[PDB]
Amino acid sequence: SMEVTVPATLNVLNGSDARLPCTFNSCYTVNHKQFSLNWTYQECNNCSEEMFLQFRMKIINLKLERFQDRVEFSGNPSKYDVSVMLRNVQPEDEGIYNCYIMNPPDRHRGHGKIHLQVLM
Amino acid sequence: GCVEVDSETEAVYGMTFKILCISCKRRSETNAETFTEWTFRQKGTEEFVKILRYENEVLQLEEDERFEGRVVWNGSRGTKDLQDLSIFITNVTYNHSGDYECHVYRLLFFENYEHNTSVVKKIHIEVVDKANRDMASIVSEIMMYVLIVVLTIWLVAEMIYCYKKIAAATETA
């Protein structure tokens, strides 16, 4: 499997900013056309995945209604970094966040999974 | 490979003459397409008139009578990338005297770059009735004999001084 470093559980206070930090590592040098990164959210383990941010040539923020405008990219992918930031976290943000990285020429696709829990 | 050599400046009347214009590409490996123009202004006159154009494989020569019918091409043949452009004249005449300017146009094909360049070579030729040996050639020949005579003279003088001394030694003992 691809070497992707994320916290399995991330506990954040309601109202604070939550950086979702993941590390992707693969040989070679990243290519802009070549490097693609996808982030998805799920309300629960079995719940449908909702893509909320992509990298395809550049960052594409899908502006999902469930996040308002609180999602930001927070990583320099050339550094193997693809972290995201969720500002002013709300209780409904609790759930599973998935990072998928496919990097040419690497055939393999990395996957990081973070369980975000919102304190009180 | 290609070398640039300047053309001869003295031509004997009533005899064939070859004018040399050679232009060499900076890099031999690169491949480009060339064409040439030669323009000549008669001596004692101003401006220039184009006499011939050579593009593709055929040579086009200006219709004027001064150069009409007595010119041949000595340039590279079949290359399509000439490198060497030379003009050969048969039956040289007084009318063929003055300044000759030859311009070269080259299309260089690179990976995604196409380059058009111009280089100009100027040759001035004056006709003469009788060919004359160059100053370096004549002087060198005269200079060579003097050197030979001195060495021969030096050796003989050397032997003469040596011989008298050797002979004298024999007498004493």
């Binding site: 040989c27 070679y28 040098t29 290519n31 802009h32 020429p105 | 490979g1 290609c2 070398v3 640039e4 050599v5 300047d6 050679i22 060499c24 590409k25 900076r26 890099r27 031999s28 490996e29 690169t30 590279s76 043949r77 290359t79 490198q83 060497d84 080259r106 260089l108 690179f110 990976e111 995604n112 770059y113 380059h115 360049t117 160059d134 370096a136 050639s137 060198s140 020949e141 200079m143 060579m144 050197l147 030979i148 060495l151 050796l155 050397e158 032997m159 040596c162 011989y163 050797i166 002979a167 024999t170």
Partner: protein, 1140 residues
Amino acid sequence: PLRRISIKILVHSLFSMLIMCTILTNCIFMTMNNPPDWTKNVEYTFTGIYTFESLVKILARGFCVGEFTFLRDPWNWLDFVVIVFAYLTEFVNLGNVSALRTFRVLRALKTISVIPGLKTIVGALIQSVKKLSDVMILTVFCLSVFALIGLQLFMGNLKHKCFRNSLENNETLESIMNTLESEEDFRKYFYYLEGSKDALLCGFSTDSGQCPEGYTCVKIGRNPDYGYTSFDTFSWAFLALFRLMTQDYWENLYQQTLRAAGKTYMIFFVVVIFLGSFYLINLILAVVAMAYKEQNQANIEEAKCSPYWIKFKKCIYFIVMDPFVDLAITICIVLNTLFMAMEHHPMTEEFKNVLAIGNLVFTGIFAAEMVLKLIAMDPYEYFQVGWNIFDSLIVTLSLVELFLLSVLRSFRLLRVFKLAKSWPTLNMLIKIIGNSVGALGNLTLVLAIIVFIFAVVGMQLFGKSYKECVCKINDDCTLPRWHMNDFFHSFLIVFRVLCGEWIETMWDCMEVAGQAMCLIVYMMVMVIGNLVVLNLFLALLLSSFSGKIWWNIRKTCYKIVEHSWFESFIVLMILLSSGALAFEDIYIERKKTIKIILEYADKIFTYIFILEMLLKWIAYGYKTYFTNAWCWLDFLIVDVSLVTLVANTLGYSDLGPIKSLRTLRALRPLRALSRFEGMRVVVNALIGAIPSIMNVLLVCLIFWLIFSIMGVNLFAGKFYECINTTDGSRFPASQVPNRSECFALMNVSQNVRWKNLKVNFDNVGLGYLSLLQVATFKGWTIIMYAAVDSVNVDKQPKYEYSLYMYIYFVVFIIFGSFFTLNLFIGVIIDNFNQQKKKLGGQDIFMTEEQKKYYNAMKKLGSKKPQKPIPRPGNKIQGCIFDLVTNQAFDISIMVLICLNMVTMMVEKEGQSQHMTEVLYWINVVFIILFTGECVLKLISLRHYYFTVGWNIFDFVVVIISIVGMFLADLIETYFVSPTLFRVIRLARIGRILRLVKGAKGIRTLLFALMMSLPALFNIGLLLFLVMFIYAIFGMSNFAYVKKEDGINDMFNFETFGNSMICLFQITTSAGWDGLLAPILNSKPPDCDPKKVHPGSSVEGDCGNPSVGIFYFVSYIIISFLVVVNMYIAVILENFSVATE
């Protein structure tokens, strides 16, 4: 009781054998590279045996006393750790699994202890390193100084690339750079030389250059070779220089720097290669060899019906006629071998049949003989003889295929060996080989063990990476030819590094595995691996080794020839005559005036030499004149010149061979050999050794012939392939499998060609050529790719179909190159030893005057104390003086210089302005402190200070440093010369040289080099003349050849400056194959026979295959012979200095 049983178990014949057998078996397992799951249990078994062996050793020895007996020995510590990691591996373990396996590799090491005497052998090798320590500091210091000079002179130079002049969209060079990272993208913008990995290197000066029109030169981007080859940083410069010292692919570095820097910098390389590489490597050999002798010799010194059947027997044993029959057989066998030698890629059926018949008669003759010997001596008597045991196998093998594999036949070639008993040298080659597996078998075995550990270690560490990265070292994303994925492949890389080929592979290991790991492993293999190889070579070599008016006129002419002005005058003519030769080149046409004087000038020279020769006849007479070797040389040269002059002068003549005779004019510099005392002396040494050299060449040919014949059978006619002409890429073989298929493609396709290698095994002569390239290691790899790839005679080659053929090349290298070279070196140095003995034990490389000077230098060695000096009367003098003589003062100054040296290292390309200012200021303080120290010594010392030689060097350095400083400053205010500025700053490196005074160990080594300078100079002069004659032959002969590989603008034979640059590269024998490649091709479509060559009369650029081969081969051999001399001169002086 238990202790007795365990102790009983511990010392047993079987137990040592049992521990060892298991260990050997484990090694086979390491080689798996993806062992099946079932093998895991086997892994468990190996672990258990190790623990069991350890327990008995620990249980019995310790006596529950802390294992005092057990851990006291150093070897067991290694043993203790291996069992534990397995327990630990089972126990919670570290994250790196690939890393985890390497630790187990040590189990293989355990083998050193189990085998008898391996423990003794390894300790001896380690003892060797202690001696090597001093040379190591010097190598580091020497490599370091050159690195500093290289960095200051060439930093940022490798960066130059042609950059396009016109850009769309208003883009700037800076704007373009961040935007593009794609390889295709880099290409549109920069020139890129037709399929090469990186952009063409360009140059600012007229000498270097050049970029095609429409492209301009600017420096940006990574250095060539993945950024690995650069002079930007001290660490990078150090790697570049280390590569130059060991001469690995040095030819490429030299070509790259020269192109960017400009040809004038060729001087840097000559000094570095000449002093840094030839000299430093020699020092290592002398120390290792010198060290080996003391230990080898020191250890050695301490020791000291039935009767009727028998009737037939009388006849045969009477018929053997040992005087005629045995002798007759060897002559017969040599004849058979010659029969074998006749083979070609294409042979008519009739010729092939004769081979079948010729072989049978030979098969018949030997067979009749084999039965005959046993009957005469009976089976027990007959079989006992060693040669006979050897022969029967030969007869047996021949009979087996009498009427029945291709591989089986290839062995018939071996028979040729029986010739060894009669020949003295054959005896030497066999004797050397015996030692490798005989007395020195233990030492040779260590080499095998070390190669095995490295191959496996490399495989474990980088095996996974090569497979995943691939794309980081290829386009088809497939594995490269040299890789570390499998054991055989991992083994091949280690083998290649043993030969000096590490850098090409290392760049690649780094792309996939990272810099830190790849560098550490390769550096260790090279240092540790080479030391063992060096020991084996040296160990093997040393062990193996041990009126009458006419009379007055005749008297007078004699007077003229003897006179100094005349001898002096003649020498001037020779130098002048030789010089005129340089001026003729492809550019002679321009500059018509020089051409005319030179043509006339030669005539005066011809007359002078002819005149001089006549004086020689009168003075010496014919008998004295022709009994002299030199005169014959002189007479032949005047004659060739004379014939051309009369033929040119006579007129009419100027057709064919007359023109060919003219090229012999290049031979003129040769007269010069007699005139210089230094040059002549080197020749005396060579003539003395030609007879000795001659016996060896024959042995090598015989040895090589077997390999060449063997090679011909295996690969003859199999190197052909169908290639796409545009990019020279072989077709897949999925389509176009055979030659017949390939032709059909051509009929319907324009650029597909079916073509041979040009250097191959088609015939025995060519095989001889192919083998030479493989032996030298230059151009060899192109051939091997061909050998392994090959399938059949008319079939397209599959990729790595043979695979194991590499074994053929590996065996040849060990026997062909390692052993013969061992023999070649052994005889030549020994012959030199005999020569020295004959001439009253005097060095043979110095002219009499040089000898007087050499003695004076010897005097400098003495340590008799110089006067102390008197503490002045004045207290200031006393106080100032008292501090200087203090021990601390020298150490403080010494430490200060080291501090200064570290400052130079910090400089790097692209350093910010702030860093530059601090470095400038920091240096000024040193400039001030150092100047300060000099003034202080002067105040106290006075006249006494000038007495010491070192003080003067120190004083001079300060003047240069300050002066260099003002000049650099002066240049900035009024001039803007970047190139000039760098050279000026070079003055400081002078202070670093002061470090030498402090280290006594290095000082002795450096001093020794000084002693050999007179001898080295003579050889250098002789070498220069030979290079000069060759350059001239080359200019006329090879200008106009098509430019292919190794021949391009620059590094071509077009002009004298250019020819000299090439010849120098080839002196080391590097890239010799590359130059020869363009010369070999003749006829379409390899080249065009008639070419215009604008600006000149000559037609065609076709190399002469016959003339070209003789020229390159002769040069390689001649240069090698002289270089053997450098190795001999350095060793002699080194022994003397160390000995004192």
